[PDB]
């Protein structure tokens, strides 16, 4: 007689067989009670054309000790099961009904007798594989009938659901996992997404890891098969498991359209984490190496790797590597990659590395802040670089300014205040007024918008050079748990792309109108 | 400088492509040093004709922080990787050499330049797939040559290596894992091994779990395809993930050769552990159910399950189930299964359940001991049952006697003293004097022979009804880490079979001459 409905703010993947539209908790069932039918309604303006099917599933009951406020006993659609990331695990969910032609009103039926107490049902939505990434569903459970009486419906279920595409799922092309996203838009409008290909498992370097790249010439609707942008196989006769390269950062040289990918090659180091096992020195046998590849053909083919360690690594550092995600071209044509180093006393520092000669030579000056790691840089105003930093103190992003490419650093007003975090990679980009439909300079930022865990992946916009991030100028994309790393790139004048580790896929692409951010 | 050699006491699987014969640590290498050649010698009476090939692998180096005493950076041959349990992970080991015709002396070569410090090599043995399970190798590294100088060899490498067979590997027939072994020998000499088929992962009930059975009519050399002995699929319209059955115990009714399998069916309980979520009551919706199948055709086909719960479960118990492993026929024809119950206050007790009518009706009297769980029972003398118990107090097995089928219990002299454990399932069987080649009553026991972790799987024999377990009357089978559950059954007059979770496979069978136990 009382039913609870959840409409979870998570991406509907156009390439998935099942996506969670509604979770339903019937908390106080009498044994034998039957959910005869439930009615969904879609909003007037919904493009029901590109909805392929809607399914009602039963998932049984809850454990006696797990309490009465959960919407599921288990993950319905796994983002980690290498054998199935695309459909509901059939061992957790039994299909009751299915409609393959969707109208604005829709009724699903069961004859399943319920157990005493908590019973779980959910609604799966399957989209046409060619569904527009910019499409939205406004769906409501309007009627639930139990023992031929309409039941009282409760819960927040007014979420506007967005589409996305699982560019990489766990198990794709034999790889256990994919991590550490980077995204740029080439001068030809081509989306380039980079990531770790983590073949054996999901652990950080050292392991068998290559740098993968997914390419889209249609604003993310389709992605060309995975290219290996960088790999070290059995270099020097050491196993591929002791020759990993990863934590990639990608940038487009906007003057030439030359694309650059920088990454950390770990050589040796047993089967342990490079973060604590990379040591002082310069040789591949001694310390992690800073490796770069380039594409001169819009990311279709990739150069052999060049070793730039000798140019920029201090011998006393335990570890120098890029900040994962992306770098930038500045207005004066300087290429800038965020970097991070562990000093002789094992203290991490964020900073920047830049080339003034199209990527021929690279320079690092002074660190921005102590006990920071992963950082992303934007040119917030001409000749003014904002470094936005993961901070081991917890709670909030560190923000510093350089006007001299990291020779000197100033604390920004927004430092350790404006942007909450849980100690996790975050994306920051600048959008020039002339390059977007708002006609105003923007900063766009994405991270897990929480001080604990990795969830509530959110795009935030600032109109005042990242002094203020108004709540209204934010879109929630993924309220469920994931590995939390993300990277932003403007797709065109009207839309921002996010390439991120989500609750629905290891590498998830979504496109968001900047008019949804700034209303 | 010196080199260190390990000959690990782990099973050589006749069905594996790779098995670790030797691990080698070269601790203090100069960059460029080359292990030119390595000589192994086999004992004069070794059956080298059933050795198919020997391989030398390089595995690179060690992590800076992991110290100097390890024999490997990583597991070389995985017992968990659903994509490969049978050959070395090629990302961790590079083959240097291979000999396919094995003599008493054997030389393996490399041209691999070593890194400064620690370098790992290992020797893989592949056996003929028809290799005798009773065969042994006595192998030693006699020469290691580096830079054309013989190096000083150190280490304990005098192990007599035994054969085994991986009856179930992780991933077999689509199942993530296999756990909880039981083994009997039918009156026809047929080996019947039962186990959890844990489809989704390796967690305990509640989950998608069936009872599997492997059958061998040739004393374990070959195993028939896996049969599902018990399964509840989508009973009552609940998902298979909320209809698991497992923790099996198997016995042969020696009077009739009727084989019986008892198991715990969990219905509902969300995706949580039944151990803490099974609750008082009697119905499948309320509490775990005690379910039984039988085979009248030597384990080829299995009856539909009968529900025994009403006969033996007190309503106030949170959980009644069998002790995993096996039950017995007593000399007077009584069938006995070890059982365990959680009382109304969540305190576990071990006991016995018996049938005097060929398995028609079952009875439980009094528990043996507070805060015990998994137990195995043997008829040490006519009408005298020894219950050997997992004890939550830690350190050692509890041992009690009943002469009245558990109405009353006496502490045995060996109680909480003679048999070390880490709080883990253990196997105990009795062998009558007339039924074995020693012509003496035996007790045989197997468990991880440690107070910490699960390793050193060992068969122990007692000649004095389990009063004493002399060190000499013990065989070490697996000194490396596993899940630790095991079950014993006499194969014939001369050999005991062990079906166990090992470091080399989820379900491992080995055969041991009792003349190796009692010398």
B17 and B46, same domain (yes or no): yes
Give the closest-approach CA distance of B66 to chain A in angstroms. 8
B275 and B298, same domain (yes or no): yes
Quick check: helix, strand or coil at residue B277?
helix
- A277 with B242: Cβ contact below 8 A: no
Q: Of the candidates A307, A348, A355, A303, which has an alpha carbon nearest to the alpha carbon of residue A328?
A: A355
**A387/A377 Cα distance (integer angstroms):** 5
**A355/B410 Cα distance (integer angstroms):** 83
Is the Cβ–Cβ distance between A184 and A193 less than 8 Å?
A: no
B463 Cβ contact list (under 8 Å, min separation 6): B440, B441, B442, B470, B473, B518
**B62/A238 Cα distance (integer angstroms):** 12
Residue A134 φ/ψ, nearest 5 degrees: -95, 0
- B91 with A63: Cβ contact below 8 A: no
Q: Residue B346: count other Cβ atoms within 10 Å of its Cβ.
A: 10
Distances (CA, A) of A176 to A83, A265, A482, A504: 10, 20, 16, 16
- A60 with B285: Cβ contact below 8 A: no
- State the SS3 of A156-201: CCCCCEEEEEEEECCCHHHCCEEEEEEEEECCCCCEEEEEEEECCC
Quick check: helix, strand or coil at residue A266?
coil
Opening angle at CA B297, ends B294 and B302, nearest 5: 35
Which pair of structure tokens corresponds to residue B16? Answer: 């594996």
A379 and A405, same domain (yes or no): yes
Judge residue A313's burial from the number of C-beta atoms within 10 Å of its C-beta, 0-12 exposed, 13-18 middle, 19 or more buried.
buried
- A239 with B58: Cβ contact below 8 A: yes
A351 and A241, same domain (yes or no): yes
Choose from A87, A91, A346 for mutation: most chain B CBs within 10 A: A91
- B61 touching chain A per CB within 8 A: yes
Is the Cβ–Cβ distance between A95 and A49 less than 8 Å?
A: no
Pairing of strands B12-13, A105-109: unpaired
- B34 touching chain A per CB within 8 A: no
Choose from A82, A242, A273 for mutation: most chain B CBs within 10 A: A242
Which pair of structure tokens corresponds to residue B300? Answer: 């080829």
Domain housing A511: 161-519
B101 and B232, same domain (yes or no): no
A333 and A427, same domain (yes or no): yes
A70 and A181, same domain (yes or no): no
Q: How far apart are the first and last CA of chain B?
A: 40
Q: Of the candidates B394, B419, B435, which has an alpha carbon nearest to the alpha carbon of residue B474?
A: B419
Q: Residue A297: count other Cβ atoms within 10 Å of its Cβ.
A: 10
Is the Cβ–Cβ distance between B408 and B439 less than 8 Å?
A: no
B93 Cβ contact list (under 8 Å, min separation 6): A239, B57, B58, B59, B76, B122
**A180/A370 Cα distance (integer angstroms):** 23
Q: Residue A154: count other Cβ atoms within 10 Å of its Cβ.
A: 11
- B14: phi > 0 → left, psi -120 to 50 → alpha, else beta; which? alpha
**B312/B290 Cα distance (integer angstroms):** 9
Q: Of the candidates B39, B29, B205, which has an alpha carbon nearest to the alpha carbon of residue B113?
A: B29
**A216/A191 Cα distance (integer angstroms):** 5
Which pair of structure tokens corresponds to residue B271? Answer: 């995706």
B318 Cβ contact list (under 8 Å, min separation 6): B278, B279, B280, B287, B342, B343, B344, B346
- B269 touching chain A per CB within 8 A: yes
Is the Cβ–Cβ distance between A440 and A431 less than 8 Å?
A: no
The DSSP bridge partners found for residue A4 are A25, A154
**A18/B492 Cα distance (integer angstroms):** 54
Q: Which of B141, B160, B179 is at the close of a domain?
A: B160
**A163/A160 Cα distance (integer angstroms):** 10
Opening angle at CA A76, ends A72 and A80, nearest 5: 125
**B441/B439 Cα distance (integer angstroms):** 7
Distances (CA, A) of B101 to A456, B98, B134, B143: 61, 9, 22, 19
**A483/A457 Cα distance (integer angstroms):** 10
Residue with tokens 């569903």: A137
Residue of B nearest to A116 (CA): B285
Quick check: helix, strand or coil at residue A419?
coil
Distances (CA, A) of A23 to A62, A107, A459: 14, 16, 25
Q: Which of B160, B181, B213 is at the close of a domain?
A: B160
The DSSP bridge partners found for residue A136 are A162
Q: Which of B125, B160, B195 is at the close of a domain?
A: B160
Whats the size of chain B, residue-wise?
519
Choose from B270, B277, B283, B284 for mutation: most chain A CBs within 10 A: B270
Q: Of the candidates B119, B60, B54, which has an alpha carbon nearest to the alpha carbon of residue B93?
A: B60
As a whole number of Å, the CA-based R_g of chain A is 24
B178 and B70, same domain (yes or no): no
Is the Cβ–Cβ distance between B316 and B343 less than 8 Å?
A: yes
Residue A487 φ/ψ, nearest 5 degrees: -150, 135
Quick check: helix, strand or coil at residue A438?
coil
Catalytic hit among B62, B126, B207, B374: B374
* DSSP assigned state of B369: E
The DSSP bridge partners found for residue B411 are B400
- B61 with A268: Cβ contact below 8 A: yes
B62 and B21, same domain (yes or no): yes
Is the Cβ–Cβ distance between A66 and B279 less than 8 Å?
A: no
**A210/B450 Cα distance (integer angstroms):** 41
* DSSP assigned state of B514: H
Q: Which strand ranges, in their side-by-side order, compose the sheet holding A177-185? A: A177-185, A191-198, A209-216, A224-230
Is the Cβ–Cβ distance between A391 and A375 less than 8 Å?
A: no
Longest dimension (CA), chain B: 76
Q: Of the candidates B229, B266, B402, B263, which has an alpha carbon nearest to the alpha carbon of residue B339?
A: B263
Quick check: helix, strand or coil at residue A510?
strand
Which pair of structure tokens corresponds to residue A128? Answer: 């046409």
Give the closest-approach CA distance of B275 to chain A in angstroms. 11
Is the Cβ–Cβ distance between A309 and A299 less than 8 Å?
A: no
* DSSP assigned state of B305: P
Is the Cβ–Cβ distance between B399 and B430 less than 8 Å?
A: no
Pairing of strands A457-462, A474-478: antiparallel
Experimental method: X-ray
A213 and A133, same domain (yes or no): no
B446 and B456, same domain (yes or no): yes
B377 Cβ contact list (under 8 Å, min separation 6): B323, B327, B328, B336, B338, B352, B385, B386, B387, B388, B428
Residue of A nearest to B84 (CA): A200
Which pair of structure tokens corresponds to residue B485? Answer: 């559950």
Q: How far apart are the first and last CA of chain A?
A: 40
**B122/B25 Cα distance (integer angstroms):** 9
- A74 touching chain B per CB within 8 A: yes
**A165/A173 Cα distance (integer angstroms):** 17
Q: Residue A188: count other Cβ atoms within 10 Å of its Cβ.
A: 10
Number of domains chain B is built from: 2
Residue with tokens 């034999």: A174
Distances (CA, A) of A40 to A20, A61, A135, B354: 14, 23, 18, 55
Q: Residues A350-380, buried b or exposed e (16+ Cβ, 10 A)? A: bbbbbbeeebeebebeebbbeebbbbbbbbb
**A26/A37 Cα distance (integer angstroms):** 14
Residue A472 φ/ψ, nearest 5 degrees: -60, -30
Residue A262 φ/ψ, nearest 5 degrees: -110, 145
Q: Of the candidates A250, A352, A265, A337, which has an alpha carbon nearest to the alpha carbon of residue A302?
A: A250
- B66 touching chain A per CB within 8 A: yes
**B369/B400 Cα distance (integer angstroms):** 8
Distances (CA, A) of B405 to B262, B410, B412: 19, 12, 16
Which pair of structure tokens corresponds to residue A446? Answer: 């994405």
| Interface contacts (A, B; CB < 8 Å) | 132
Catalytic site residue B374? yes
Contacts of B34 in chain A (CB under 8 A): none
B470 and B335, same domain (yes or no): yes
Q: Residues A22-48, buried b or exposed e (16+ Cβ, 10 A)? A: bbbbbeebeeebbbebbebbbeeebee
């Amino acid at each position: 007689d009382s039913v609870y409905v959840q409409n979870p703010q998570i991406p509907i993947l156009v390439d998935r067989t099942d996506n969670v539209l509604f979770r339903i908790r019937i908390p106080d069932a009498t044994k034998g009670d039957v959910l005869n039918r439930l009615t969904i309604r879609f909003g007037n303006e919904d493009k029901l054309s590109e909805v392929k099917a809607v399914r009602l599933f039963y998932a049984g009951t809850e454990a006696a000790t797990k309490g009465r406020s959960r919407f599921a006993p288990v993950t319905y659609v796994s983002s980690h099961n290498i054998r199935n990331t695309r459909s509901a695990n059939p061992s957790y969910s039994i299909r009751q009904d299915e409609v393959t032609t969707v109208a604005n009103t829709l009724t699903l039926k069961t004859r399943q007798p319920m157990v005493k107490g908590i019973n779980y049902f959910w609604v799966s939505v399957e989209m046409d594989r060619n569904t527009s990434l910019l499409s939205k569903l406004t769906s409501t459970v309007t009627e639930v009938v139990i023992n031929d009486k309409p039941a009282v419906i409760a819960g927040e279920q007014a979420a506007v659901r967005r589409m996305g595409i699982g560019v990489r799922h766990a198990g794709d092309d034999g790889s256990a996992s994919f991590r550490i996203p980077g995204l740029v838009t080439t001068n030809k409008g081509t989306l380039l997404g980079v990531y770790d290909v983590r073949y054996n498992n999901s652990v950080d370097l050292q392991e068998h890891i290559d740098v993968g790249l997914s390419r889209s010439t249609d604003k993310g609707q389709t992605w060309e098969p995975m290219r290996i942008a960088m790999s070290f196989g059995e270099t020097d006769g050491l196993p591929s498991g002791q020759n990993g390269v990863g934590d990639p950062s990608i940038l487009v040289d906007e003057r030439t359209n030359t694309v650059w990918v920088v990454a950390a090659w770990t050589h040796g180091m047993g089967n342990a984490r490079a973060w604590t096992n990379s040591m002082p020195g310069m040789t591949p046998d001694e310390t992690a190496q800073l490796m770069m590849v380039k594409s001169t053909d819009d990311g279709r083919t990739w150069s052999e790797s060049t070793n730039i360690t000798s140019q920029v690594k201090d011998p006393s550092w335990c570890f120098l590597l890029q900040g994962p995600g992306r770098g930038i071209t500045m207005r004066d044509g300087t290429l800038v990659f965020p970097i991070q180093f562990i000093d002789s006393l094992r203290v991490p520092h964020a900073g920047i590395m830049y080339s003034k000669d199209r990527g021929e030579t690279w320079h690092i000056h002074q660190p921005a802040r102590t006990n920071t790691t992963e950082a992303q840089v934007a040119e917030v105003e001409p000749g003014v670089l904002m470094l936005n930093m993961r901070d081991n103190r917890g709670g909030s992003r560190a923000v510093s300014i350089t006007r001299d490419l990291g020779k000197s650093w100033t604390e920004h007003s927004s430092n350790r205040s404006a942007l909450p975090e849980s100690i996790c990679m975050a994306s920051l980009i600048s959008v020039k007024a002339k390059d977007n439909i708002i006609g105003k300079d923007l900063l766009l930022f994405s991270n897990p918008n929480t001080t604990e865990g990795r969830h509530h992946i959110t795009i935030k916009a600032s109109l005042d050079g990242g002094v203020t991030w108004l709540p209204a100028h934010q879109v929630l994309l993924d309220e469920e748990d994931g590995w939390g790393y993300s990277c932003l790139s403007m797709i065109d004048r009207e839309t921002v792309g996010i390439f991120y580790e989500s609750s629905v896929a290891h590498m998830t692409f979504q496109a968001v109108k900047i008019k949804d951010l700034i209303r």
